[PDB]
């Protein structure tokens, strides 16, 4: 048993709050915000050795990242930002920082009861997205 066991699996979005405002703060344009805000993604998390894979799949976009904790990688986001990403575990929370154009946003994933809670923060704007097991 190990580092991310309680995150592994297939998760489905069940609620969102403040996501349009988060996307605005990040710089996402109108049409992408509308279509992305409608999305109901599945988040699929797996681990093989030290490599964690996170897939996000919806009618809007299918994306996938694989990474080792603490080890930076280049990522193209679903909104076509080219970012430098680092994901770490901080007291049981997966913390994903994305850097681009002198900006930064942080996405935190936490297990809470039977949910996986995702908090997306850009400056003073936070969005909370709740996922349940599929
Ligand atoms: O699945 C998704 C993933 Cl991985 C990422 C996004 C975004 O890139 C966000 F919010 F992260 F900035 C954006 F901009 F399109 F909204 C949205 C969905 Cl729905």
Curated annotation (Swiss-Prot):
GO biological process, one term: positive regulation of inflammatory response
Top-level taxon in the UniProt lineage: Eukaryota
Record flagged with keyword Cytoplasm: yes
Residues bearing PTM Phosphotyrosine: 22
Post-translational modification Phosphoserine, affected residues: 15
Binding of a fatty acid, residues: 129-131
Keyword flag Transcription: no
Function: Lipid transport protein in adipocytes. Binds both long chain fatty acids and retinoic acid. Delivers long-chain fatty acids and retinoic acid to their cognate receptors in the nucleus.
Free-text comment on this protein's domains from its UniProt entry: Forms a beta-barrel structure that accommodates hydrophobic ligands in its interior.
Protein name per UniProt: Fatty acid-binding protein, adipocyte
Annotated source species: Homo sapiens
Gene: FABP4
């Amino acid at each position: 048993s190990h580092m991310c066991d309680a995150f592994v699996g297939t998760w489905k979005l069940v609620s969102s709050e403040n996501f349009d405002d988060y996307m605005k703060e990040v710089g996402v344009g109108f049409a992408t915000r509308k279509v992305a805000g409608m999305a109901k993604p599945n988040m699929i998390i797996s681990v093989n050795g030290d490599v964690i894979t996170i897939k996000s799949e919806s009618t809007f976009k299918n994306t996938e990242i694989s990474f080792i904790l603490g080890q930076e990688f280049d990522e193209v986001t679903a909104d076509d930002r080219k970012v430098k990403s680092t994901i770490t575990l901080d007291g049981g929370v997966l913390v994903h920082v994305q850097k681009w154009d002198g900006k930064s946003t942080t996405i935190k994933r936490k297990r809470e009861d039977d949910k996986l809670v995702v908090e997306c923060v850009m400056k003073g704007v936070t969005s909370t997205r709740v996922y349940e097991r599929a």
